[PDB]
Amino acid sequence: ALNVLIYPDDHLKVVCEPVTEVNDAIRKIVDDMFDTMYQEKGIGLAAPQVDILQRIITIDVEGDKQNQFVLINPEILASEGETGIEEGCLSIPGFRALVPRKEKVTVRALDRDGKEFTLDADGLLAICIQHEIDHLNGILFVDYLSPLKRQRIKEKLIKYKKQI
């Protein structure tokens, strides 16, 4: 549906603009993002990964459309606990790394209709939310690695991207 930017790319390092209003054009990006995300078997996507520099996230932790989450202009209000899993990312294909995260987050955001909601999450949902928000600030999971590890990932994908 949309093309996923592959690390390294400058638009994966940008702090994105909030959505000014959630209208039809924004709902179309959201639906196009979900299509892209399911097609590549992701459980989260952020707009900058499809080269749209706005604060828009689509998440589906189960992958079956029965607990979708759209988070527009999201903000973590509070959090607690400590956790970490081996995260991957559609813009960083072929790699996973252990990222330290909050176990629990409270997040406010606008839904696909522009309505504000405030959500408590834990488990994999909370991890996905923190991951995807990182994207909106131009942060990738490789930024939590040592400079040399991140570099070696970058070199490998530079090559991959040519070979595609």
Ligand code: NI
């Ligand atoms: Ni990601």
